[PDB]
Design a protein around this ligand. Sequence first.
Ligand SMILES: [K+]
Ligand SMILES: [K+]
Ligand SMILES: [K+]
Ligand SMILES: [K+]
Ligand SMILES: [K+]
Ligand SMILES: [K+]
Ligand SMILES: [Mg+2]
Ligand SMILES: [Mg+2]
Ligand SMILES: [Mg+2]
Ligand SMILES: [Mg+2]
Ligand SMILES: [Mg+2]
Ligand SMILES: [Mg+2]
Ligand SMILES: [Mg+2]
Ligand SMILES: [Mg+2]
Ligand SMILES: [Mg+2]
Lengths: 59, 131, 60, 116
Amino acid sequence: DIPGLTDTTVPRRLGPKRASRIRKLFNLSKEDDVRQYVVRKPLNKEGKKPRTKAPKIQR
Amino acid sequence: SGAKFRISLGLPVGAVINCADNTGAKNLYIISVKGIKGRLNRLPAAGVGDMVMATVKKGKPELRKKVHPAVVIRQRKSYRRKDGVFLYFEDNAGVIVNNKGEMKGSAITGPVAKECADLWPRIASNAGSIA
Amino acid sequence: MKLNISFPATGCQKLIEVDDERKLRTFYEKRMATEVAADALGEEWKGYVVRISGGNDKQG
Amino acid sequence: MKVELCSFSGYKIYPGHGRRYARTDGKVFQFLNAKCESAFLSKRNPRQINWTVLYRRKHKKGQTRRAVKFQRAITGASLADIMAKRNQKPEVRKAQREQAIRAAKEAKKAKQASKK
RNA sequence: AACUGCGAAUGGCUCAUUAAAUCAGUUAUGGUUCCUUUGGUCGCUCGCCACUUGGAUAACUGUGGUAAUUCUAGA
RNA sequence: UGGGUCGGGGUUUCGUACGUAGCAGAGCAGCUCCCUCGCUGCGAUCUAUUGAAAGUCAGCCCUCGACACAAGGGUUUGU
RNA sequence: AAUCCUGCUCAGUACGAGAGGAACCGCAGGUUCAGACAUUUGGUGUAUGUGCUUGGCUGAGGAGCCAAUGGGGCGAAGCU
Ligand SMILES: [K+]
Ligand SMILES: [K+]
Ligand SMILES: [K+]
Ligand SMILES: [K+]
Ligand SMILES: [K+]
Ligand SMILES: [K+]
Ligand SMILES: [Mg+2]
Ligand SMILES: [Mg+2]
Ligand SMILES: [Mg+2]
Ligand SMILES: [Mg+2]
Ligand SMILES: [Mg+2]
Ligand SMILES: [Mg+2]
Ligand SMILES: [Mg+2]
Ligand SMILES: [Mg+2]
Ligand SMILES: [Mg+2]
């Protein structure tokens, strides 16, 4: 590993949105609770209560 | 400091060179070269960076029938530049200056030889490009 | 001369500053989108083939 | 060991050889010898002169499929989380689809009382 | 914020050019184009996704270059 | 051993030889049981063979390949 | 058998009210002359070297030749 380069992998900022791009990523077949499988991003600010934020899924 | 090295002259007295400044003169007819002691039957000749006395043959009437100091900025004779390169230009060109060394015009059309630049800082500042 | 290195698998791109021509000259005379091995730099850049993706001129 | 130049013919001009030509329009050219210089002055195109480097590469005289995609962590789920979710495949997924239907079926029975 | 759609061809200024040219009245497009508005038309066709298919790209995070620009590159 | 003469290599000059081939070629002329889109000619030029061909010490450089030739001739010279 | 000049520095210094304004040493170059030289650049070029080309000629091709150096481009060496 290169020091400071091949380590501390950065995550993709935010997951798939289209109702098919989540199925390919998670091997959804059909109507397997598609809504819940979408990635829910958590938000953590000091001057506020913790809360997670889900996106609107298209198609 | 550093003085100018000898270069091939190639512009004898009687040569009509183009005037590269915006003074309104179109050509310059070299009548003599400054600093020439000379020799029997030898024509005083000038190269780039040489100060010459010239009369404009065609141009504007207020410049015509007079003797103007001029400095050769481009020459068509090839000359060696101490580093092995033989350089020559597409035409013989000069600019009209005063005895002090300041160009009467304000802009120069075309390149200016490097020898003429560092020898005449006033001409160098007005030069669009340096060859 | 600076080198922008990015590894898509882990992100975390970082800038490398080099003043040695020989480490750079493996890259020299190469076009874009050509994969070159960076075995020139030290003993840590080994087993690494890298693709030229772009750059900038002295004037930017 | 000066700057190494190239001619009208693409050849490599060592110091002390050839001439350099500065045109009035500001462009500067260097030629290896009078042959290359005279050809340039007569406006001959080097792509049509056989012994020129430009001609040789123009006529080329003498001289797969790949793709990869990698799983990554996505903010809100580590690579472990997505793998576990997509590893619910062996009927665990089917187990989750069917409980949602009955979890919406009794709501539909309540919705029938709410619709009508 | 950004992608998208629309507008930016209106308005305003000036009168240099221009003497059957411009322009005015009259007439034609049975010799053409036309965003928009309004009204028609949108099952008229026999011919392993349709309970919804594919890929990228913005904005965004991150690394910069350039003296400079409403400049931009790579990831 | 020698120096020659050829040959070879190097260098260099010019610029890509003849022949052959091409569904290259402005086009044109003949054959149509033929062909179902073709064949047989003419045609400057183009492309490949081909940085090819040609010259290069006669006052260019190196050969150790080949061939013959080289202890031969004449005139003089003494304290 | 060498010759003379310019620029930089000395130095906006000495000197002078001011305006103006040197010199010695040192450095970098030039003029005229002299003696060579051809690595480079230029000139020559009948290597009659290699392409191109007009008229004619060898039955055509190929290969050439004649036109007092046919003309022209490029050109080794040598001279310069
Ligand atoms: K004189
Ligand atoms: K041939
Ligand atoms: K060829
Ligand atoms: K000739
Ligand atoms: K010559
Ligand atoms: K010569
Ligand atoms: Mg939608
Ligand atoms: Mg006389
Ligand atoms: Mg030989
Ligand atoms: Mg004397
Ligand atoms: Mg003939
Ligand atoms: Mg013939
Ligand atoms: Mg005869
Ligand atoms: Mg005769
Ligand atoms: Mg010649």
